[model samples]
Target: VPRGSAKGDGVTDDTAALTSALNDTPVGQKINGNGKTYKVTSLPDISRFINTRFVYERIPGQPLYYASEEFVQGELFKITDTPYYNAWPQDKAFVYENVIYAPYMGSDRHGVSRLHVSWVKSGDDGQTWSTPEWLTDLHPDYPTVNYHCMSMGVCRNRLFAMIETRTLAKNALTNCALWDRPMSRSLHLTGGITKAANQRYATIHVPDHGLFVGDFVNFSNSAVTGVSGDMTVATVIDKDNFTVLTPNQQTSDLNNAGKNWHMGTSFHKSPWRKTDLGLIPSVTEVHSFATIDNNGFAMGYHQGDVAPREVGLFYFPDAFNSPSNYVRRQIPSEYEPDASEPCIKYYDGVLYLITRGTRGDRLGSSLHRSRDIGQTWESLRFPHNVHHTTLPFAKVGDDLIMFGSEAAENEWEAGAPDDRYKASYPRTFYARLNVNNWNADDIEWVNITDQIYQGGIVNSGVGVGSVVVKDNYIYYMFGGEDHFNPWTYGDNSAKDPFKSDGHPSDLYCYKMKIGPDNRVSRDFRYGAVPNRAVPVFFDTNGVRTVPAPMEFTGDLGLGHVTIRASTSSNIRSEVLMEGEYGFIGKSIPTDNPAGQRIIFCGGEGTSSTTGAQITLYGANNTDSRRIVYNGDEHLFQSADVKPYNDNVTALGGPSNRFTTAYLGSNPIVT
Candidate 1:
C-alpha cells in the first residue's frame, strides 16, 4: 500500500504514517516504495529498524526504499535476551577453517542466562556471511551469580572454550573441548552384584567407579554369571555403588572370583570433554586465554578480590580437560589492577599482556611483555591516558595492533554518567608497534571510532574487545552509547531512560592492501562519513610529515605512498621522496571528520614491492571485502571495489554497519 496515498490522494507529509507502518511490520520483510520517493530525517529508535526490520533507502526516481533487513547494529545480544535486558558480549573470538567464532551471555527461553557460542562462515572470502550459527550452550547452575566471561581457542583439530564464574570469593573455572573423543578406563566392582529374588533388580557395588546416574554400561564376566548384556544404569547410590535393572530377579549371589567381572563401554559419551579447572580462592576472574604450542593458559587476577594485586596465571598443557599444571607466582605491578578484561597475545614465543591501570595518575593501560611465560615481566607505560582496562590486541604481519577505547577510570558502575566514563568519542583507537625493533615512540596510532561509529547505550566510545586480522583485514567490535554497568544496572538505576531501548552497537571492518613492500592502504566509510580516504603514513624516524604523493598502481582506495627508514638519523631524509606519505602535522584536510581518516603504517620490512602481496577485496557492502590481492602492478580494480553507501543517518542502515566481517583469518597464507 502506498504510505500516504491509501485513499488515492496525492502524497502529503506522511513521516508519521510511514514510520507507524514500518514499526508494525516484521523484520526482513519488504514494504512498498509507492513510486514516490521519501526522505526520512528524524529516524526512530534503532530497535524500530532491528525489531521491525526496517531501513530507509533513497530511491532513484522516488524518495526512499523502506525495507526490512538485518544489519550490524550496536545493540549487544540483540537477537538474544537476558534479565534486565543486559547481556555482556565477551570480547573473545577465534577463527578456524574460515569460520569465525565468538561467545556471548544470554538467557534461554526459561530466562536462565547461559553462555552461547556462535559462528559466522564466509563463502565470499569474508565479504558475505551466512547467518550466525548458535553452536554450543554452557549452562551454569547459578546463572546470575556464577555467570561471567567465556574465552575460546583452537588447538590442532578440536575447539576449546572456558568459562569463569565467581560466586563470592570462591571462583570456579570450567573448560569444555568440542568434538573430542570420549575418555575411557577400566573399572572394578568391589565385590559383585547382590540381587533380591522377585525384585526384578539387583545392586552392583563398584568402588569409586566415578560413574554417574543414567549411564549405559556393558559388563564382561567369566566367573560371575548374573551380570550380562548392556545395562542402563538406573541409580547411582554412591561413588562405590550403583544399581542396574535386570530382566529377571537374580536368585544366586553374583561373585567376582578372579579378574572376571569388568565394566566395558564408557559411561559418558559426549563430544565435549568437561574439566573442572579447580575452584581456587585467588583465581577469581578469568581475563583471557591463549594457546601456545598446543598448551592453553588462563590469565586473570588474584589476592581474594582486594584490588587485583597480582596476575594469576594458570597453565593447561594437556587438552582442555587437564587440570592446571601449576600457578606461577603473582606478577607484581605498579598500578591498582582491574583484571576483568585483559588482552593476552602469544606471538612467536613472547607473551604480551596489556592491562588497565586503576591509579588516578595512570591514564589508560600498561603493556607488559614476558618472554619466560609469565615468570618475569617488563612493564612499559602506554602513551594514551584513557581508562582502557578492557581492550583487544593482535599481531598483524610484523606489527602488533592494540585496540583501546577511552573508557574513563572507575566509572564502570551504572549511571556513571556520560562525563565519568566517556569512550574515546571517535570510538576506538588502535596502536601499531614493530614487534622486532619495538619502540614506544615509533607507535602509529589510528583512531577508528569515526570509521566504525560510537553510539548505543554505552555512549559511542569504543567499549571492550580486541582486534583480529584475517586475510590482511583487521576486525574488532566495541561501541555503546552509555556504558550501562551490567553489574550494577539493576541495583542503582532500574529506571534508566535508555534501558531496553534497542540502540545499536556497530561491527565495523576495513579492507587493507599490504604490498610486497609492506606499504599499507585501507578503505573506510561510516554512516557519518562517506567516501572517507584513509592514507596511512609510517614515521620511519622520530620526525612525522606527509610524504610526496606517488602514482598509485590501482584506482582510488587502492594504493598510497609508504615510507621506510634505515636509521633514526635519516628518518626525515625520505620526507621529500616520491611514493611516501606522512602526517601533515595535524593540518590535513579533514574529510569525514566524524572519525579519523588516516592510518599510520609502522613496523619493519623492506620498502620494496617484492614480497608476497596481500589484498582485502570487498562485497557490494561497505566495509565488506575479502582479503585478496593480485600482488603485481594492478591494485583492486573497479570490479573489485565495493564502496560504502551514503548514509543520511548515523547508523549505516543494513549494508554499511551490518556487513560481513572476520577476525584473524589465515595471516600466514600470504
Candidate 2:
C-alpha cells in the first residue's frame, strides 16, 4: 500500500506541513518525506532529541535553606527535582576514560539537612544517562548538618566535590562550611553476619559498615535464604555495627562461617573533609568552578556576602590541601560594589571572568581578563550597554556562544525603561569576539529563539543547571522555576526545595539539544537570513568543525549582483579551497592592483592559444566582482582591433572612439 503525500503538489512551500507531521510523531518514530523534491524556504531543526525526564523530587515540608526578600534574593540550592539533585552542571561534568561523570543533588525531607552529593553518568557523549548514585549522606562530625552540594570536578581518577554545609534547621547562618572530598564510589560493605535462631534482627560487624538508617542494600546470596536481598537496614548502632531485619526465627544461636554481606549501589565510601578557603566566618554564593591552566583548579566566588562584594579567587594544586594565595585576587573596586555571578572560563592562554556588575542602576555583563594566569585582573569596558546579566558561556571555534536572559529595552537603545531594562527572559545569544580588542562588546548579539522548528523555549535563565557543547549539539540542562521575574528572571521569590508545589514545572528536568533534521535541506541558489545564531558545525568524527554563527551580512546569502564576466582568465588562482576547513572563498580575486582601489582586470593575452581569454579580477576589499576594464587592448584580439566608425552613442562613438592609446605619469602637462 502506497502512502499519500504531504501536499505532493510540488509547487508549494511545505516547510510547515512537514514540520507538523514530524512533531506529531513520538521520539523513536519517524516520518516519510514522500520521496518528493518539495520546495522549502529553510531547513527544519530536527535529528537531535528534545524532551524532559523526571530525575528526582524532595519529600516536601522543609524550609529556610533558601533566603529571599525585598533588597536581595539568595539561595543555597539550584534545585533539580528527581526533588532530584541540585546540579551546578557547568564545572561539575568530567570525562573519565570514556564515561562522562556529572554530579547533582539529593536530600531528606528537610532539604539541606541531608542535601548531599550524587551523580548521573553517560557513556555515549551526553546523549543518554544512567540513574544518579548518592555520594555523601550523614556528616560524621555533625551528623545532622544540612548538606548543600555545590560545584564538583574530577581530578586524577577520583571525583572531588566542594559541598556547602549549613544549618537548614534555622534562619541564621549558625555554622556554614564547604566540605571537600576525593570521593570513592560504592560503599563496599564486607560485613559478616551471625544468626541466633530466634532473633529477627541480625547484628553485623562494622568492617566500618558505612551506611545510614534507611539505606537499601542487597545480598546476592545470603547464608540463609530467609536473610535475602532488599534487606532494609535499621538502628545504626555506631561506626562499626548496624542491625538488619530478617523474618527467620531459628530456635538456637547459630554462627555459620559462610555468612556474609555486600553493597550493590554506587554510594560514596569516604568521609568528607571540610574547607572554607579563608572564608572561615562562612556563607558565600555567586561562585563557579573552572579548570585553570596551571595544572591546578580555580574556584571564583563572590566573597564577603554583601553588596560591592569581592571576586574571591582560590587556586588549589590539590583541592583537599589549602588554597595558595600566591596568585589569588580579591578584586575590590571602589566604584563597582555590586559584582555578582562570576561565571569564569579559561581559553587560549588567558583566564576570563564574565561577572555581572553595575555602574549606576544599569547592569551589564562585564568581561574581566587575567593574562598572568589569575595573577592580575582588569575589567574590559562595554562598548555600550543594553543591561543583560552575566551569561554562562563557552567557546566554539572563533566565536563565543553566550546563553543568558536578555531584556527588551535597555540603556543602549532608545525608549529605554526607567529601570534601564524590561522582560527578564532567557534566550540563546552569541558573538564573534575580537579577543585582542577590549571593546569586544562591539559585536552582534545573535539570538536563535525564533527558530520555531527547534527547542526555542522562551523560558528563563541560562544559569539554571548546566550547558555542554559536545559534538555538534548544545546540551543545555536549564529548567524548573517560575515564568516571570526581572533580573535574569531574578524574581526574589521562594522555592522550598523539599515541597512539591502544585505546579508541575518544579518537578520536571528540561534537557534540550537543538540541532539538524537532515544533512542537506532544500539546496538553493540563495540562503535566507534572519539574524540569529546557534553553533552551526560543518564537521565529522575525525575532521575539523568550522564555526558559522548564523549571521547574514557582506557577500553571504545574496551572491555578487553586478556586472558579470564569462571566462575566468585574469583571476589569480592562488587561494585553493581547503578540503576540510569548509568554505571555498568569500569572493574571486582582482587586477589593476597598482591604480584603482576597487580594481578589476580585463586580463591580457593568455599563454595558451585558446582564442580571446578575458579574465575579470576581484577587488581586495569589496565582496563584489562585477567590474572589468573596457578597452580594445583587453577586450579584443589584434585582428579585431579597430575604431568604431558607427554613431551608435548620443555622444557619437565614431568621434569619441576614433582614438588611440595614451600614456600616463605626469605627461598630461604636454
Candidate 3:
C-alpha cells in the first residue's frame, strides 16, 4: 500500500477497491458506497516541454506588433498575436552588445536601392524590435555596385559586414575585399624599390613580403608617391622580392629603402577593395563566409567558371593580403547543377557546408566536411531522403542546433517535370543534435509529444527556416502560408487562399530553453497524458462514445474520459452503463489546489419514508461511498475539510455534516 492514493490523514490503503461493472443490478436498484472511502490506485506522472511562441498579425509593414505564448504543462496559455516586419530575415539573429540584430535584404524601401542590406535590432530578449535601418548605401561608390550577396561576423572589437561588390561590366570583378578597418602601413612591411625611369615593372625588396604573381599591393610614404596607383604583382622573384606592373614608367631611378608598403585594397580610402580569387576561372556568387581560428573560409558558386554547376571554396589566413594568400578548391556533385547555394560554417576546428546535392533520383540538402581546411572533402550526405535544405544550424558552446523541413510527398521522387507534381504542406522541425561524427544519418530528430503543433506548425513550400544559437537560446524564425489555428484537416473542401484574414503570412519565433535546468523534453503522447477540460454530459438512457476533442489533427487532449449525467429525465429510468471514467473539473480540480461547489437536488419523501439516495462505487461491487438526501446525513463521513463551514451553516446544518461528496470512486467536494 506504499503506492496507494491519499486518505484524509497521511495514511495509505489497499482496502477493497471496486470498478464499475454493473451488469447484474436488478430493476431500480442503485448501489452506493455506504459512507466509506474507495481504495485509490496510483496514477502516472506526466511531463512535457514548455514551448514558447512569438507571433504577430500577418499584415505587412505593421510596426513591432506581436504576441508571446508560453506552453507550459498542456495549454496554449495565451499572451497576444499581431504583424511585425515587411521583409525576410537574410541572416539568423546574432547578439552583440547584448542586443539581438537581424540583417535583411530589400530591393527597394521608401527609395530605390541596388540590393541594399538593412538591420532590425532588439534589446529585450526578442520580445520587441526596432524598425529596420539601412546598412549599406543605396548607391555604393558609383561604378562599384554592391550586390545582394552578404555575410557578417564580429571579431573581438571589430564587426565585419561584407557585401559582394562588382564592376559595371559583367563578370569583371569577383568577391571584393572589404574590411571594417584599413590596414595601416606604419607597422607593416616597409622596404625600398629599385627602378629605372623607363621601366614599367619595379622590383621591391622587403624583409619577408609574402608575395605571389597576383597580389594587389598599395603604396604610401613620400618615396612611393611618385607612382600613385594600386599595383598588381606581375611576378615573384624570391621571398623578399616581387615585381609590380605599374601604370606609368617611374620618372627617375629611385634609390630609397623606406617607402611604406602595404598589400590589399586600403588606399582607395573606402571599405571596398577588389580581391579576386586569382585562379584559372572567374568565381562568382560568393555569399557564405565565416571567420574562425583567425582564418576566413568562404564558399561561392562557379557556373561554367570551370564547367557549369561547380563551386569554389576559399581559405584565407588574415584574409586577402595577397591574392595568393588564399587557397581555392572545386567541388562538383555527381549529378548536374552541382553544389549550388552552399553556406560554410567552421566550428571546433572543422568545416561544414550545407548545399544541394543530387546523388541518385532525389535532390536535397547534402552536408560535407573538411578538417585540413578545404583541401579535400570526405563525405557528402543528406539528413534524410525526404528533406529540402533550409537547414540553418549553429553552435552554442559544445551543442549544435538545427532547423529543417520534410519534403513534399513525391518531392523525393525528383518527380515528373513541367508542372506535374503534387503540392504538399511540409512539416518543419528543430533539434539540438549531439554527434561524435558529422554524418547526417546519425542525427535523431525529436517530436514534442507527437503533437506537431508543439514542435512546428505547417508552412507551405519552405517549411524550414533559419536558426542561430547564441548564449543559451536558439532563435528559429520562419514564415510562409500557415495552417495553424482556425484551420484543420477536412475543415475546408478546397485550399483557402493564403492569409484569408488580412494575414499574408507572418514570422514566428519558437524559443525554448536548452540550458542546465530547462531542456526540451518529450511528454507521454498516448497514455497518462496531461489532463484536459473536455467534460461531456450525457443522458442516462443512451450510449455515447468519448471523443478526444482537439480542433486539429494531432491530440494533446488525451486524458481520462469525463461523462456526466443529463440533469433532465434522470430519476425514473436510469442505468449506470459500464465505462472507465474520470472525475475532475467540478469535482476535485483536475489542476491542483483549487476547490468548487456542487448542488444535488430533486427528491421526494414523506415522514419516515426518506428521500432519494445517491450511490457511488467502483468495479465489482466493492466498498463505495453514499449520500442520502433525507436519511442518515450523519452517515456521511464529513471529518477532514478545512474550508467548509460557509454554505452548509446557512442551509440549516453544520458545514462538516456534508464535507465531501463522491462520484464513482473519486472525491467530489459538493
lDDT of each: 0.46, 0.45, 0.44
Q: How many clashes does the backbone of model 2 have? A: 22
lDDT score for candidate 2 against the true structure: 0.45
**RMSD of candidates 1 onward, in order:** 34.0, 35.6, 32.8
In candidate 1, what are the lDDT values of residues 1-670, reduced to their tens digit?
A: 5545222122344467666777678865555443333334443443343212222322222221222223221112212122223223345566655554444433221122333444443343344334444544444455433445546555533455555543322333443222332224455544566666656666777654445455556776624444677776688786567787777655665545345467744515523555555555555455566666544554444443564456545555655334444455355456336433456778888877766544333444666677877778876655434353465777777877766554433232222333442333333445567766756643434332332222222433235553455664555544333333432234423322234432234233332222232444332232442121233454778554445554554345535655566456866425453456643422223463233222222223433244444433224323344443333454446573345764333434555584643445743331
Query: Using lDDT as the measure, which candidate wins?
Result: 1
Name the runs in model 2 displaced over 4 angstroms.
Answer: 1-91, 105-114, 138-145, 167-283, 293-295, 318-327, 332-335, 357-360, 382-390, 406-432, 449-462, 469-474, 482-670
Off by over 4 Å in 1: 1-91, 107-125, 129-146, 166-270, 295-304, 335-340, 407-426, 441-444, 451-462, 479-670
TM of each candidate vs. truth: 0.44, 0.43, 0.42
Candidate 2: tens digits of C-alpha lDDT, residues 216-264:
5555545643556666566677655667788777787654355445543
TM-score rank, highest first?
1, 2, 3
lDDT of 3 by residue, 492-570 (tens): 2223322232222334454555555364543323353223334344448675434565344334465664335544665
Error of 1 at 198 (Å): 41
Candidate 1 RMSD computed on C-alpha atoms after optimal superposition onto the true structure: 34.0
Q: What is the lDDT of candidate 3?
A: 0.44
* Backbone clashes counted, model 3: 12
Candidate 3 lDDT for residue 116: 50
